[PDB]
Amino acid sequence: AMSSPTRALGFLYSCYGGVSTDLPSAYLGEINSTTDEYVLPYSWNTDGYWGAYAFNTASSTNQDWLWGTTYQYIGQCYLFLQKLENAGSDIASDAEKEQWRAECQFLVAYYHFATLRRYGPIPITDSYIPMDTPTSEYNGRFHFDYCVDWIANQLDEAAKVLPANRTATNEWGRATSTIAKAVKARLLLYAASPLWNGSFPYPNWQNENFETPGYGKALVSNTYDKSKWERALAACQEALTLATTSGDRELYDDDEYYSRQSLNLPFVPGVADVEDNKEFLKNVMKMRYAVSTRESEGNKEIIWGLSNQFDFYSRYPLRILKKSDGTWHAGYSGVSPTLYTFEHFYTANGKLPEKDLDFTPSSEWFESAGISSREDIIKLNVGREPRFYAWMAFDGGDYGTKFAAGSPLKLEMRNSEMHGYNPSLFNRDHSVTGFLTQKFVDPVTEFYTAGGSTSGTSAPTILFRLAELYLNVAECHAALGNTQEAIDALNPVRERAGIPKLTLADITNNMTIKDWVHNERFVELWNEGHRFFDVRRWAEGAKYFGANKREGLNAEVQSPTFEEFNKRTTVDAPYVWENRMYLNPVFYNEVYKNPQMVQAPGY
């Protein structure tokens, strides 16, 4: 029970059990595969929950009940805390008890946050609830702003006690003050956002028979409050300062890991491997490693990462390599980046393709770039930023480095017997848009002719990393009209990625400071489980997630010509946006079970 130090530690370990909820980058997860970043084949809607959320068929009886999990571990935390109060000096010292209490405090707060960000106003559960508790005493939802204040206060208390950094020695990353402050930063940032700060779509949604101190039956603010941005800024600043001092965090900036691993610099159209281009090409590899390495490999950017892995086959091309037995190594090729993605990664000059005077006019984006032996490469895919070539892949281009028996795999997205659409051969699997991503793919990844393969060295799945803290501070400054300081916050991230810094001159009526911040966030944290939340908190669901917004190439036709393939094509699946989609529906049974609980609007 708590009959010994090792038993107690085991109990504490089990309290961390819910932290993988809504895991970033997991391809079947709705926070990953329902945004305008990329789409999955419509026929994959039978797998997981992503379909129900993308196509608005989620319901109180058809939903991902992560609430079940978060409050489960919240209860586990308070159960632990209860037993610990009765535990003697034989179990743990007073100093260690203090540490354990802080860890639980952080976990409870985080678990509430994980629930809040999906469900909106939630019941605050700050004790263990005995199963014989009368139904009349169940908490209902507390007003969003009440929830925010409590979570924030809990994180601040934990932060007083927890260490700022820990050495990574195993797969259990225990809480730090740095993580506590980072969570609070993202929390307040969300809270200051339009959805929760003046633009909630259902102003009249409220409690029926439950009161929040300070708010009565109200559940969400309907009035813009600038002070929320002020507090968010201070919180984001503090998180950044902590992380970069006693947190011992810094942006991954190693330009030579590829070299130490005996790899060639990557092929990039229009950027040959010559002396003058070394910096650009090394930046491409830097950005591949930045999101696929361990601290033991020199990465000090991760604030909170998990040992939990996510699947890669879903992003690999179809036929990878023919084995000596005549059979093929194959991927699923389902993770399909949209034209929105391909149009909002930057040009080499650090600008949007549409906006960049030095970039191809949109009228010519789908023409061949005329690259010898790679004529399939269209002009849109030439002249882009390092992050583009690091993380994206396209017809005529290379996928990976060691990928196919030690060589990069050239993509043939129009070939029905290689990487193109062909249900008779590949069943459900194909790129929906004619693009692919190789983000998170270890450069050492390699499939062998003799059979078997390697994915190099695994890396933690990232929950919080330092680049985000820069972006969070930038967004707060932007909201407050601090233009130079917003710029100052973005520039370390831009500089690391090998594109030009911003100046005041770049802020105009054609590209606002908010445009820059939001787009830098779109790019840097692409496929890291942010866009789902960011579009929602910005109250821009209809704009970005609505019907017909998602586009790609003409990729669901067999054996197309170059000309047939390279046409702007609406993704042909029943994507929609409706306002109820901002919030996750509450499990039917829970609404029934808790008399004080109210369903999300529209469900």
Ligand X SMILES: OC[C@H]1O[C@@H](O)[C@H](O)[C@@H](O)[C@H]1O
Amino acid at 158: A
Q: Is 205 in the site for Cs ion (CB under 5 A)?
A: no
CA distance 237 to 475: 11
Amino acid at 527: N
* Crossing angle between the packed helical segments 513-524 and 483-496, to the nearest 10 degrees: 30
Q: Which one, 55 or 267, has the nearer CB to ligand X?
A: 55
Q: Minimum distance from CB of 446 to ligand X (Å)?
A: 21
Q: Which one, 334 or 541, has the nearer CB to ligand X?
A: 334
∠ CA 162-118-513 to the nearest 5 degrees? Answer: 80
Q: Is 47 in the site for ligand X (CB under 6 A)?
A: yes
Q: What is the x/- site pattern for Ca ion, positions 91-130, by CB under 5 A?
A: ----------------------------------------
Q: How big is the chain, counted in residues?
A: 603
Tokens of residue 309, six digits: 């892995």
Q: Is 442 in the site for Ca ion (CB under 5 A)?
A: yes
Q: Minimum distance from CB of 365 to K ion (Å)?
A: 8
Q: Is 429 in the site for ligand X (CB under 6 A)?
A: yes
Q: Is 242 in the site for K ion (CB under 5 A)?
A: no
Contact segment (CB under 5 A) with K ion among 53-61, 139-147, 322-330, 379-387 equals: 379-387
Residue of 199, 277, 349, 360 interacting with K ion (CB under 5 A): 360
- How many Cβ atoms sit within 10 Å of the Cβ of residue 71? 19
Q: What are the φ/ψ torsions at residue 23 (nearest 5 degrees)?
A: -65, 130
DSSP letters for 453-485: EE--S--PEEEEEHHHHHHHHHHHHHHHT-HHH
Q: Minimum distance from CB of 316 to ligand X (Å)?
A: 11
Q: Minimum distance from CB of 46 to ligand X (Å)?
A: 8
# of chain residues touching Cs ion (CB under 5 A): 4
Q: Minimum distance from CB of 334 to ligand X (Å)?
A: 6
CA distance 45 to 66: 19
Q: Minimum distance from CB of 47 to ligand X (Å)?
A: 4
- Of residues 304, 352, 348, 312, the one with CA closest to residue 329: 312
Q: Residue 244 class from Cβ within 10 Å (0-12 exposed, 13-18 middle, 19+ buried)?
A: middle
Tokens of residue 206, six digits: 């409220």
# of chain residues touching K ion (CB under 5 A): 4
Question: Are 374 and 355 contacting, i.e. CB atoms less than 8 angstroms apart?
Answer: no
Task: Say whether 27 counts as a known binding-site residue.
Answer: yes
Longest dimension (CA), the chain: 76
Contact segment (CB under 5 A) with K ion among 215-223, 324-332, 383-391, 563-571 equals: 383-391
Helix, strand, coil percentages for the chain (3-state, nearest 5)? 40, 10, 50
Query: Quick one: what does residue 359 bind among Cs ion, Ca ion, ligand X, none, with the CB cut-off 5 to 8 Å set by partner type?
Result: Cs ion
Q: Which helix (H) or strand (E) holds 454?
A: strand 453-454
Residues 207-236 that bind Cs ion (CB under 5 A): 222
CA distance 568 to 585: 34
CA distance 40 to 180: 34
- Of residues 25, 194, 549, the one with CA closest to residue 338: 549
- Of residues 236, 124, 153, the one with CA closest to residue 479: 236
Q: What is the x/- site pattern for Ca ion, positions 131-150, by CB under 5 A?
A: --------------------
CA distance 573 to 534: 23
Q: Which one, 145 or 398, has the nearer CB to K ion?
A: 398
Q: Which one, 288 or 329, has the nearer CB to Ca ion?
A: 288
CA distance 476 to 486: 8
Query: Quick one: what does residue 457 bind among ligand X, K ion, Ca ion, none, with the CB cut-off 5 to 8 Å set by partner type?
Result: Ca ion
Residue of 457, 503, 559, 561 interacting with Ca ion (CB under 5 A): 457
Query: Quick one: what does residue 395 bind among Cs ion, K ion, ligand X, none, with the CB cut-off 5 to 8 Å set by partner type?
Result: none
Residues 168-197 that bind K ion (CB under 5 A): none
| SS3 of residue 446 by DSSP | strand
Query: What are the start-end ranges of the E strands in 405-448?
Result: 407-410, 435-437, 446-447
Amino acid at 475: E
Place of tokens 């000090």: 300
Q: Minimum distance from CB of 183 to Cs ion (Å)?
A: 28
CA distance 319 to 15: 42
Residue of 174, 322, 323, 428 interacting with ligand X (CB under 6 A): 428
Query: Quick one: what does residue 429 bind among K ion, ligand X, Cs ion, none, with the CB cut-off 5 to 8 Å set by partner type?
Result: ligand X
Q: Is 359 in the site for Cs ion (CB under 5 A)?
A: yes
Residue of 2, 151, 183, 382 interacting with K ion (CB under 5 A): 382
Query: Quick one: what does residue 292 bind among Cs ion, Ca ion, K ion, none, with the CB cut-off 5 to 8 Å set by partner type?
Result: Ca ion
Q: Minimum distance from CB of 133 to Ca ion (Å)?
A: 48
Q: Which helix (H) or strand (E) holds 328?
A: strand 328-330
Residue of 266, 383, 386, 420 interacting with K ion (CB under 5 A): 383
Query: Quick one: what does residue 332 bind among ligand X, Cs ion, Ca ion, none, with the CB cut-off 5 to 8 Å set by partner type?
Result: ligand X
Task: Say whether 398 counts as a known binding-site residue.
Answer: no
Q: Minimum distance from CB of 595 to Cs ion (Å)?
A: 5
Q: Which one, 383 or 585, has the nearer CB to K ion?
A: 383
Q: Is 45 in the site for ligand X (CB under 6 A)?
A: no
Q: Which one, 44 or 365, has the nearer CB to ligand X?
A: 44
- Of residues 316, 210, 200, 272, the one with CA closest to residue 579: 200
Question: Are 192 and 479 contacting, i.e. CB atoms less than 8 angstroms apart?
Answer: yes
Question: Are 387 and 393 contacting, i.e. CB atoms less than 8 angstroms apart?
Answer: no
Tokens of residue 27, six digits: 């391809």
Task: Say whether 457 counts as a known binding-site residue.
Answer: yes
Contact segment (CB under 5 A) with K ion among 355-363, 516-524, 525-533, 570-578 equals: 355-363
CA distance 109 to 125: 10
Q: Which one, 327 or 363, has the nearer CB to Cs ion?
A: 363
Q: Which residues bind K ion (CB under 5 A)?
A: 360, 379, 382-383
Q: Which residues bind Ca ion (CB under 5 A)?
A: 292, 442, 456-457, 459
Binding-site residues for Ca(2+): 292, 442, 457
Q: Which residues bind Cs ion (CB under 5 A)?
A: 198, 222, 359, 597
Binding-site residues: 27, 292, 428-429, 442, 457
Q: Which residues bind ligand X (CB under 6 A)?
A: 44, 47, 332, 334, 428-429
